[PDB]
Amino acid sequence: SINSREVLAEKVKNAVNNQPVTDMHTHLFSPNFGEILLWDIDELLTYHYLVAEVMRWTDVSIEAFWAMSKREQADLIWEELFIKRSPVSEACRGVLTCLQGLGLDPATRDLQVYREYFAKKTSEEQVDTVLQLANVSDVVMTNDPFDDNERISWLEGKQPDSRFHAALRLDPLLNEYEQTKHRLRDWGYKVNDEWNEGSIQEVKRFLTDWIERMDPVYMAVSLPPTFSFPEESNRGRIIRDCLLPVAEKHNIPFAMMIGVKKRVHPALGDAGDFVGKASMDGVEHLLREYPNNKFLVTMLSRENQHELVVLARKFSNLMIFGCWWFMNNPEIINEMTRMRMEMLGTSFIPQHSDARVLEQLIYKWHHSKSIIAEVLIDKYDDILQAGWEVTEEEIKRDVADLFSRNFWRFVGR
């Protein structure tokens, strides 16, 4: 038996640390796709999360910033966020966790020496190194066929190795149909200006074609805080008449990341998005009215978190996942994971990395695993006190479900 919390803590920490992770949502790509897979210290430092932060300190105008080279940008952020002020924020701390994990020494602050480490490795080598360090066995990518560069790679035979899984990202189709319908036509999908049977079948064809070419684990889309459903709009009709039925047929879950308010600050680029609390009505309707469809949902507002958990108690076809973007900070990750486990036990997916830069897998999982471990230790200790006798194998089992099995079990694969 586990006679003390101290022994329980060590055992839980070991289980969590040893458990290979399936990162069900990232912005990483199989290395064979080429330069689109971003990596190295300069990429880590230029992560848009750090761009927003540096802009709060530097005198360098945003225009000037974008005009600088990748190396110059990295130098500026290093100086502004690490040298001039202690790198205490979550994103800055993450850069340090990566460096340390790669065997580099943050104590020297020798940026040139860190760069040299990367300059002598191939992408294939760095992916092997990182996946081993972060103990990540499977990476789910975000594949947007509407992006010209991504589309051409797929059309020209590019396929990911077994460690990388595809996910059909449909933001342009679902949120900008008025513009996107023209491109569908240019690609041979005869969508009409009237939402008729022809338009429905062609949008379905598009989805089916890409499902066949990508073999996605799920279809996804990020939605605004004003998201509602049903709705007489292109989004409402495409979801209802095309997406859901196609998803039901192939038994592919629909991933909705709700709460992002796009481009409140255009100049910042990828760092210019904001957040807003959403109504749960649209989500509630979808789960109740489409019982044969699977939905993976993560929300951006802190104020949506608790009710999202309650909604998960209502419908089994709802699998909530991760602590997304602005929620991906220790204070939030902790409260979210606790409310989730208290109302759902182990029937959820606590985290994903959303890694845009390869090395981030190291800090994203290291930082989150330590928090999730502390939650588990409290929960296990609580039942041990109630007289329950939890075993190490059961612990390893629960941990496997949280970090990998629940996802694969849900996507039905």
Ligand X SMILES: O=C(O)[C@@H](O)C(O)[C@H](O)C(=O)O
Asked if residue 124 belongs to a known ligand binding site, the reply is: no
Please report whether residue 161 would count as binding ligand X according to CB under 6 A. Answer: no
Asked if residue 331 belongs to a known ligand binding site, the reply is: yes
Taking CB under 8 A as the rule, which mask of x and - marks residues 300-339 in contact with its own copies? -xxx--xx--xxxxxxx---------x--xxxx--x--xx
Please report whether residue 102 would count as binding its own copies according to CB under 8 A. Answer: no
Please report whether residue 85 would count as binding its own copies according to CB under 8 A. Answer: yes
Give the shortest CB-394-to-its own copies separation in angstroms.
5
For the beta carbon of residue 389, count every other beta carbon within 10 angstroms: 9
Of residues 14, 57, 146, 183, which one binds its own copies by CB under 8 A?
57
Please report whether residue 359 would count as binding Zn ion according to CB under 5 A. Answer: no
Please report whether residue 325 would count as binding ligand X according to CB under 6 A. Answer: yes
Please report whether residue 147 would count as binding ligand X according to CB under 6 A. Answer: no
Residue 354 contact among Zn ion, Cl ion, its own copies, none, beta carbon within 5 to 8 Å by kind: Zn ion
Q: Amino acid letter at 25?
A: H
Please report whether residue 212 would count as binding Cl ion according to CB under 5 A. Answer: no
Pairing verdict, β 260-261 and 274-275: antiparallel
Phi, psi angle pair for 101, to nearest 5°: -65, -30
Cβ-proximal residues to 405 (8 Å cutoff; 6+ apart), any chain:
none
Expressed in angstroms, the distance from the first to the final Cα of the chain is 35
Of residues 105, 110, 197, 303, which one binds Cl ion by CB under 5 A?
303
- Whether the CB-CB separation of 392 and 164 falls below 8 Å is answered with no
Site for its own copies in 366-395 (CB under 8 A): 376, 379-390, 394-395
Residue 275, strand partner residues: 260
Site for its own copies in 242-281 (CB under 8 A): 264-265, 268, 271-272, 274-277, 280
Please report whether residue 27 would count as binding ligand X according to CB under 6 A. Answer: yes
Asked if residue 48 belongs to a known ligand binding site, the reply is: no
Closest CA to 18 of 102, 121, 136: 136
Of residues 46, 126, 180, 222, which one binds ligand X by CB under 6 A?
222
Give the shortest CB-175-to-ligand X separation in angstroms.
11
Asked if residue 63 belongs to a known ligand binding site, the reply is: no
Residue at shortest CB range from ligand X: 222
Of the pair 174, 223, the CB lying nearest its own copies is at 223
Closest CA to 140 of 292, 290, 283, 298: 298
Give the shortest CB-220-to-ligand X separation in angstroms.
8
Please report whether residue 155 would count as binding its own copies according to CB under 8 A. Answer: no
Of the pair 101, 225, the CB lying nearest Cl ion is at 225
Rounded to whole angstroms, the Cα distance separating 407 from 348 reads: 8
Question: Binding site for Mg(2+), residues?
Answer: 331
- The residues binding Zn ion (CB under 5 A) are 354
- The residues binding ligand X (CB under 6 A) are 27, 142, 222, 257, 270, 325, 354, 356
